[PDB]
Symmetry: D2
Subunit: 454 residues, 4 copies
């Protein structure tokens, strides 16, 4: 019960790009799968000839849109599953996650009074880092479906390089549907807002969000009243992102491009934008060096051990040309620490004259065990603290990065539903970290819109 692909038996990379890529990949790389080199090379050779998930002109367009974010003239929303799985890579699940992100985007667009750049964790979020090799059950840790299987048995946890090709197949299939959905009616502003209005009338805390929902509704109707050309309301752009973790995968998805802008560059065409996590951001490591040789916008996760001085080193290495929006610094401090730890980092980075996007990840600093879980109020409070830090400094609170789903899961405590510890057992479906369910993600949008409205 296998499908079977052939290992395929152009002009070479420009000499300098080959040199730089090899140098980047020769550096130490944390959190890599352990599979045979010959097998990995077979899979890379397959992936080097597949159609790309994204194309360079979209990445250049995203860079332009992110430059507006960095300049204080747009807001970045990034969200989706903590981990995609091959099993749940289905039309309803994709449709649900795209809907949940669009619903947030409407509320955040209105609240920010500026465009929102909408970036899904989708079409490649198939690899995760682990602090431990051996898990709580004594098994080799699950590292996402690009590496091994979620099932709790030894054979499933074996690192399988064929998962590189399965991950690409699943990613391009998802991406095709995201494109179709967003261009063909799912992203109609009016339809998306109708879902928000239904949330407000059926949610336990709907009375809380009714006033802002109605103001949004009246804002939408005002556009029709004014006779606005409305094609821009019928569709939205949803960009693809994931953590750039498995370097066998990312290097195989590199393509060379440019006869539009000056010189040929390497673009990672597995996504539009990628980020480097806490456990793989070693300053002299392969992940950061790889990010230096690709043209895509990138982000780096910054946790509570971050110094102002290291943050500047990231900026100087990853934004060497001072291109607004090329670099996003993703704060994940914990709600109890963000107000204290973030200001000195922001000050020192702003003093460089570079314009990064400051993005809040309020998930990864606020996890505990009841089930691995997160309380909704701590999530909300970290974004609140993040906004306070920026208001005090006159800097731009540029966006959020959240883990969400359109599914009615029971993974995070709280929200208007008041999800309890005993409730968690009902629909705890994440392959990894607890996600805000569709209602909690929308509620967070409304709360953040009020922080924006200030």
């Amino acid at each position: 019960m296998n499908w079977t692909v052939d290992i395929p038996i152009l002009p070479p990379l420009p000499t300098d790009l080959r040199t730089r890529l090899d140098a980047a990949l020769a550096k130490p790389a944390a959190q890599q799968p352990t599979w045979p080199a010959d097998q990995a090379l077979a899979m890379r050779t397959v992936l080097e000839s597949v159609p790309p998930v994204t194309v360079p002109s979209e990445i250049v367009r995203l860079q332009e849109q992110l430059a507006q974010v960095a300049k204080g003239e747009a807001f970045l929303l990034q969200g989706g599953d903590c981990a995609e799985t091959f099993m749940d890579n289905t039309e309803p699940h994709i449709r649900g996650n795209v809907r949940a992100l669009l619903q947030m985007a409407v509320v955040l667009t209105y609240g920010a009074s500026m465009p929102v750049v909408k970036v899904a964790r989708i079409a490649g979020q198939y690899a995760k880092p682990r602090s431990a090799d051996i898990d709580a059950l004594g098994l080799r840790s699950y590292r996402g479906d690009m590496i091994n299987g979620f099932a709790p048995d030894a054979a499933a946890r074996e690192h399988d390089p064929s998962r590189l090709v399965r991950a690409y197949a699943n990613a391009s299939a998802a991406m095709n549907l995201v494109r179709a959905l967003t261009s063909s009616g799912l992203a109609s502003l009016h339809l998306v807002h109708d879902w928000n209005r239904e949330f407000v009338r059926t949610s336990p805390a709907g009375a809380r969000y009714e006033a802002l929902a109605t103001e949004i509704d009246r804002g939408l109707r005002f556009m029709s009243a004014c006779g606005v050309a409305d094609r821009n309301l019928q569709t939205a752009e949803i960009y693809a992102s994931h953590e750039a973790l498995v370097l066998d995968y990312e290097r195989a998805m590199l393509r060379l491009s440019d006869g539009d802008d000056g010189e040929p560059q390497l673009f990672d065409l597995s996504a539009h934008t990628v980020w480097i996590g806490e456990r793989t951001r070693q300053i002299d490591g392969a992940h950061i060096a790889f990010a230096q040789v690709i043209a895509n916008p990138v982000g780096v996760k910054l946790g509570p051990n971050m110094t102002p001085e290291l943050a500047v080193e990231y900026v100087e290495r990853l934004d060497p040309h001072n291109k607004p929006g090329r670099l996003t610094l993703v704060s994940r401090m914990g709600n109890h620490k963000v107000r204290d730890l973030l200001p000195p980092i922001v000050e020192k980075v702003q003093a460089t004259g570079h314009q990064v996007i400051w993005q809040c990840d309020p998930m990864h600093g606020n996890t505990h065990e009841s089930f691995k879980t997160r309380h909704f109020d701590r999530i909300v409070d970290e974004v609140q603290g993040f906004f306070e830090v920026h208001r005090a400094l006159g800097t731009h609170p540029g966006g959020i990065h959240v883990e969400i789903t359109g599914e009615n899961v029971t993974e995070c405590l709280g929200g208007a539903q008041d999800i309890s510890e005993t409730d968690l057992a009902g629909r705890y479906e994440t392959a990894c970290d607890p996600r805000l369910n569709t209602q909690q993600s929308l509620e967070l949008a409304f709360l953040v819109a009020e922080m924006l409205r200030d």
Copy 2:
């Protein structure tokens, strides 16, 4: 000190239109100037060859926009000076009245959540009816600058047919500027709203209107955030209207048109839309019969002696083809009477299956003497009662007709400025009835927007 025009020494009217026009004009006509027939005919002959103030395709476009109003899908705002004068027919005064109307329109567009058709009392509002021939000073009454002079002496009050040509010259000059202003930046939504925001921060009652002003602001910014094509925000259409009173003038401004829609029709090209007042709406009179033979949208003022049965007769005579928006019925009952008198008229007219625009004139039923004056709260209360009548019947409160100016006059009592009886003497400038000043007109817009929001 006279300029001097020549009395000019095509194919004739279609036989049926000539018959119908002659029959209409042979009927009794109230409130007509008393000047020699030979002199009137000389002036009409001059006016029969002048460039028209308006063109038929604009009137057909206005009919279409008014049909939406009648169907409950748009709102009609009509406003301007009670009487234009040749003396104040100046760029600042025109600009100020156009601004005051645009400012109202923004607030009303947002409040109604639907398009507003914007109709100025302008480029022809130069004639008024009088209940008395002899005024309080013993002089022949002033009847507007198309007939005689405002100055309180006998010679000025003589009816002068040369005022027909002066009125046209002044009207076309004003109309030219209204067109220029509205197409070239004065009607930019963003600029107009900036004036409203300034009103809110400097008005004595600005704190009252701050919340709705900010919601409007956020509605405007939302359009930019969504990337709306914005040329429709850079301009607005302001239509010209006046009371069709002086039949020598209106008949001379008739032009024949049509090779677009079936047959040639007579259009009154002195305005886009005209109305018939209380004192000239005799059912078998020349004014109503004249309105039957022109293609323009028309309105009829309905005062407190109106019966349901007469209202239906107006509808059947003036909207014989059941064309939504061809007829506007303009309620002016007084705030103390509107809730009682209007419902039976609305019911009986709705039962016909015709769709008229129901428009509230809250000025002409609410006048008293301290100076002729009106209290702002009675004006507001009549519109309130009008909205209540319609809410109860499920019918469409279709618009308002007000007398306003961009000037900081002191003519109506009250408003956030609390204009007192002693204040009236400061800037009582109207050639006729007391107007809401620029601040009072804007305040009324905000109050009516809340009636719309309900």
Copy 3:
């Protein structure tokens, strides 16, 4: 053996499954011979995969095809005769999309009306046969959804896992088509610059200069007039293939959200000359799906059977739902097409009349290669236009086999491809395609038929 294996892990409504099951009980010609249990397992995988297309796209195409049927638009359908998995690459997809778009610019200008642009792409992985045993004594190649092109027995086995490989390749191709057409490849100005360069370097460029310059001047006129230009920055390219392998097509059925059955493996599909049996499963399958459909009509067609297709496949008289695709041969089209058109017009229904000038015009070269002469291809389109001109009916579109590659598969054109030139770059896995230059030259020639 230079392969890698990839492991494989609510139903449609009962009423619609009852319908489908009744339809698919009809005999199906040209089906793969793989085991039913294996086929079922693969269908079960495909029943839950993300679809290649979505229903609102198909509803939109139907609207645009209604306009073609009414004489207010023109249908351009084009791509590889047979897509292969190994050539399903970015350069090849980009080249085929480019080639179709280049034709569409010239045809839009020449027709003076919108062109509905439909690629043979993201699914054209199966073909009937041409014979039980091929010339090498092997089971015939049936396209990559069924078996492998490689001339060995093992490759030629019917492998139902190729259903999943086909879907993976289809969705990956469609993803790229969507990306390219939304991000700059379908910019009218860019596409027309490629056309200008063709006129500049083509051996017959002098012939097409005047019309190229007209188009250029029409394009500049748009800028001159200040039009809002976002609609010049992108184009819609729809996906199509021959609906042949019913295991694949049935597994890709989905219900719309409301609700109808759509085949979401493509936007539109057609039924070929060998599988259009009026009481067969392919026609029955086309009857039950909501997608716009086509039926190939070759020289054995009678007017009466044509009417039977209209009655089966357009029961509700929806203009443009059914396309009748003429493929007669240039020597027969003028004679055979008119009585079919007359009888079908007399039904009251509005079909699209589309010319396939390729499939009735194939012959074998003295040098061995299956080939087609460019002049016969052009002549059938010409005769097709003459038939419709004479009847007052709409010559609604063309259906061609083309590539952006500089292949040597069809004889003639301005390059004067000879029988000896055929050996250079004969790369098709099935029928000979117009190369990029020949396909654009055809577009210019058909543009002059539209202008005439």
Copy 4:
């Protein structure tokens, strides 16, 4: 006497009035001889009337003229030689606007760039003279702003009330121009239908069929491509006249809201051949206003005086602020224009080079009428194009005298107007105009110069 009399009832800033007063102390040629007290009273009326144009319109025109100066747009200027109060009617205005728009369609297509459309309208009420005493022994007609065309002594008196009559007629005309151009008369599709009908019925229609059909096909291509079409529904027609009567022009000065001085009697004005004295009041007046301005350059022009105009009137090097309007005669343009262009280009400034092919090509017929031959009109434009082609400079526009009336004033064209035909409909109050057919024929001929 068949007339009716119409009774007549904060200052500009002191600094700007000081400037103006200094400028207007310069001698002014060709001014009316009415009494100063009367002139002052009329100016005082005009100082408070609603303006004919507004500053943001003039700023917008300046932006569009900057593009013409840079070779990225073309200037079309056209209308009556002299407007009269009695012909300032809806049919006549509509016809002249129609005629200009018809030319603009053909020229936009031919230039492959935007056309800035400027009417001689809403102000062209004054002219210099041609002589102290006309051929009837009367004081000369000076245009309707000054006196009456009627050949009697009383009509020929200089009457300053005509300043107010002029303003009333100007504002009424401009009102109508705005209405017509915003409400359907300037619909591209409608205007082009009039052009098609001209090609269909013109004696020389066969000559212009090919280009008319190209335009039609360019228009249909826009619809085919789905462009957002509101910008095809309207056009901007700007107002211009010769700034001659300084009492009128100074009284129509306004300050922008911020602030500059604009002459709000028009969008753009030019200074004629008889009043362009370098140290005169007209040049000084053009120097102080912010409007785009033109200067007529006839055959006595030297390159050096041309440079003096550039330095006086474009002190800030604002491209398109100054237009130099060549009127040499077709027999002299090729010889006289090049050295003027070279010297002016060497200044570094960017003027608009505009061809007036009318005023250097007037002669008298044997039958008495002042006339112009169409072939000489066309030939000067041709030579103008040749001069600029040879220098690598931009042939920036044309300035023509035209009407929508079927008059018989210019000899030739496809209608072959003869000397004997001139007596039929010679209606101009001054110079001979191209009739509606001749003006459109010229547009086709200049479109081919642009295409060549």
